[PDB]
Amino acid sequence: IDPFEMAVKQLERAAQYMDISEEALEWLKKPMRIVEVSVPIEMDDGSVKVFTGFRVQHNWARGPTKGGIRWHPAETLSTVKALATWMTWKVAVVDLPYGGGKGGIIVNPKELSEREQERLARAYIRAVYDVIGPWTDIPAPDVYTNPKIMGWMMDEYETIMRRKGPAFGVITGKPLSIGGSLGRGTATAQGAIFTIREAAKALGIDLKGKKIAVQGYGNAGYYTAKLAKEQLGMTVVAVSDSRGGIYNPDGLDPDEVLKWKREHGSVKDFPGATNITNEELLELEVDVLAPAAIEEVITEKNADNIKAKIVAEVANGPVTPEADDILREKGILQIPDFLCNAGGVTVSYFEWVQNINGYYWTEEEVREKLDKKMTKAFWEVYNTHKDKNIHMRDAAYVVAVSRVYQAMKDRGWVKK
Ligand SMILES: NC(=O)c1ccc[n+]([C@@H]2O[C@H](COP(=O)([O-])OP(=O)(O)OC[C@H]3O[C@@H](n4cnc5c(N)ncnc54)[C@H](OP(=O)(O)O)[C@@H]3O)[C@@H](O)[C@H]2O)c1
Numbered sequence: 001i002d003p004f005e006m007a008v009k010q011l012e013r014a015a016q017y018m019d020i021s022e023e024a025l026e027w028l029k030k031p032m033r034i035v036e037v038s039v040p041i042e043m044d045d046g047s048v049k050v051f052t053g054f055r056v057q058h059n060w061a062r063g064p065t066k067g068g069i070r071w072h073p074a075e076t077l078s079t080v081k082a083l084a085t086w087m088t089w090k091v092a093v094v095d096l097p098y099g100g101g102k103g104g105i106i107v108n109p110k111e112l113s114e115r116e117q118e119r120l121a122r123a124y125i126r127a128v129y130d131v132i133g134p135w136t137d138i139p140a141p142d143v144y145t146n147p148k149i150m151g152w153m154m155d156e157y158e159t160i161m162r163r164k165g166p167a168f169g170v171i172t173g174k175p176l177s178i179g180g181s182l183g184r185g186t187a188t189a190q191g192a193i194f195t196i197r198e199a200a201k202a203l204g205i206d207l208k209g210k211k212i213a214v215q216g217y218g219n220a221g222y223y224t225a226k227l228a229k230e231q232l233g234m235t236v237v238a239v240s241d242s243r244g245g246i247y248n249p250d251g252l253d254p255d256e257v258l259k260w261k262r263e264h265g266s267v268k269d270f271p272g273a274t275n276i277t278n279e280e281l282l283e284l285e286v287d288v289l290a291p292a293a294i295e296e297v298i299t300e301k302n303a304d305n306i307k308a309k310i311v312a313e314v315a316n317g318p319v320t321p322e323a324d325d326i327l328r329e330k331g332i333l334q335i336p337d338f339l340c341n342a343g344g345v346t347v348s349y350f351e352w353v354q355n356i357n358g359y360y361w362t363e364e365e366v367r368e369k370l371d372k373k374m375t376k377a378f379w380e381v382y383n384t385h386k387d388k389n390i391h392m393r394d395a396a397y398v399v400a401v402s403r404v405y406q407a408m409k410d411r412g413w414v415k416k
Contacts, residue, residue, distance in 0.1 A: 003082035011085070014397030017390055021416040024405055031058040031081050032099075037127035039105060041119040051120065052106045055128045057137055058084040060099035061407035064135050066091050066172075066348065067101025068142030069124075069149075075104040086338065087345065092400035094342040094377040096349050101137050103128070109144045121149045125156040132157075134169035134356065140348050141173035147184075151175050169355035172348035181351030182363035183370065184344075189223030190367070191343020192314050194374040195335055196288055197232055199310050202382050203333050205287065207232040213286040213308065215278055216293025216315055217241040217257065217267055224290055224314055226254040234288070238273075240281045241266055242293060246273035247280070282306060291318035298323045306332065313337035324391060334392040339381055346373045 008029050015025050035055040043049050054077050057065040067084055080102040088100025105124060109117060131137060141150055150173050158167035168179030176182070183190065200207045212234040214225045221239070228234035229252075238247040239257055243266035246257075252273070261267045269275055282289075282302055289308035291297045295317035298306070303323035311327060312335045313319060319327070319334075327334055350369060354360045361369070377399075385395030408414045 001076065001078035004078040004085070007082035007085045010397070011401070014394065014401050017388065017394055018398050018402060020401065020405055021414060023416055024408060024414045027408065027414060028059070028085075028401070028404065031056050031084060032060060033057040033131065034077070034081070035128055035131045036077075037124070039120065039123045039127050041116065041123050044113055044116060053124050053127055054080040054102070054104045055131055055137070056080045056084040056102045057131070058088045058100040058102075059404060060136075061404055061411055061413060062092060062099055063097030064133075065099035065101035065137045066096070066140060066345065066352075067103060067137070068140040069103035069105075069145050070142045071105050071107050071109045071120075071144040073106060073108045075106045080104045088404065089397065089400035090338045090342055090345050091349070092403045093336075093339050093381065093396050094346055094373050095380075095403070096345070096373075098138075098345075098349060101139070103139050117149060118152045121152040122156040125153045126160065129157070129160055132170065134166050134352070138169070138348070138352055139171040140345075147173050147175050147180070151178060154178065166356050166358070169352050172351045174351070179351075179355050181347060181354060181366065182361065183347050183366040184351065185219075186223045186227065187347040187370070188341050188344040189220050189314070190227050191346060191370055191374045192224050192290065192312055192335075192340050193227045193231060194343075194371050195340055195378045196228065196290075196310065196312050198375055198378040199312070199333055199335060199382075200232075200288075202379075203310065205309060207234065207287075209233050209235055210287035211285070212236050212288040212290065213281055213284050214239050214314075215245075215281050215289075215291045215297060217261060218292060220314060221290075221292035222254055222258050224292060224312075225252070225257075228288070228290075229254060237286065238276065238281050238284055239267060240276070240278045244268040245276050245278055245281050246270040247276045247284070248273035284308070288312060290314045293318075296320055298327075300326065303327060304330065306330070308332065311335065313340045316341060321393075324393060328391050335378070336381070336393040336396040339377060339392070339396040342377060343370060343374065346370050 037053040039053040084102035091098035235251040283305040288310045290312040292314040298319040303326035381396045
């Protein structure tokens with residue numbers, strides 16, 4: 001509807017910058033498989049309640065589809081389809097043998113208990129077994145789905161499969177006790193850190209004691225700031241949550257910021273730092289900028305006032321396309337949000353590899369492998385963005401869609 005057609009429009013805006021076939025563009029627009037299921041559960045009161053579950057596998061030319069599961073009351077098939085179409089290219093940009101998928105249940109998990117959550121997860125797996133699998137479709141954690149739910153669903157899948165294969169590999173984000181992966185907690189942020197270091201290297205600027213402004217202070221934002229300070233030599237000077245923000249040119253301690261927010265519910269009035277708002281945060285003179293909160297933080301109204309040299313879109317959708325154009329014509333190097341947030345997808349791929357191989361990597365090995373994947377993804381995007389003189393998002397889209405086109409042409413799906 002709205003989101004699916006938005007994804008289709010983004011795909012066409014990418015395709016007009018590359019030599020793709022018309023039949024391939026049409027094939028990419030239509031998701032390969034959509035599964036609607038009536039997921040039944042027995043409520044805690046003894047009644048039976050049926051929810052609507054969606055499993056959309058957008059494409060599997062490059063390999064088994066990889067996609068999250070979302071439990072949000074406002075879910076429609078359009079949102080699932082668009083998101084699946086979108087992490088198709090997420091797994092494409094970072095060179096994974098994956099397709100894109102999305103799972104969803106039209107449900108309000110706020111008033112579902114632990115028993116109800118377990119039953120709903122188990123019943124969703126019972127409904128969507130025939131269309132999933134370790135080599136076919138790998139669900140992953142997403143909004144309102146925590147690794148406890150995935151332990152439950154892996155249990156159900158191994159129960160139904162009778163443990164004939166690598167059950168652990170059917171889904172990702174499982175608890176560390178049963179087929180979990182190290183680096184899953186700090187994954188997206190750490191991959192964003194590798195991309196930030198690579199962008200600084202490409203731009204020609206060194207990160208020793210530079211300035212980074214991080215907007216949004218969820219787990220991802222705190223990890224991004226902490227890892228940037230610890231590794232890159234970043235002197236973070238300002239961080240904001242939804243409620244408010246702080247500024248301190250002397251540098252910040254992300255551990256202290258997290259402690260303050262936990263103690264007081266927000267980062268408001270952190271000691272030693274002036275209280276500022278998010279719009280104050282966006283225009284600050286920093287070297288790196290990283291938005292990690294609600295989508296479309298940067299708008300056309302506040303794009304020409306950005307002074308940061310590098311923008312790392314840690315959060316999804318944070319910059320409007322015309323604001324992206326403004327930042328491009330300002331000499332500001334960006335990082336596409338789906339290219340930036342590819343750390344979680346890369347570590348989920350790593351977890352799947354560990355499950356399939358039966359061998360579990362250390363946090364060290366995971367870190368170096370994520371480093372390699374993230375660096376090659378960013379460098380491919382930047383090199384296409386240099387050769388074709390196109391935007392960051394356009395370059396990443398070109399890389400992803402070119403890979404998917406090559407996968408289909410090799411599979412024979414599209415003869416042209
Ligand atoms: N792109 C991908 O494919 C992919 C794959 C994996 C992960 N990811 C990313 O990584 C994140 C993984 O999700 P997450 O689980 O880490 O989100 P999270 O922020 O840890 O959410 C956990 C939720 O569980 C509840 N909770 C926490 N502790 C609890 C306790 N002791 N008892 C009861 N409830 C508790 C919390 O709400 P209450 O406290 O109110 O219950 C909270 O909302 C996602 O946000 C996603 O963006 C992405």
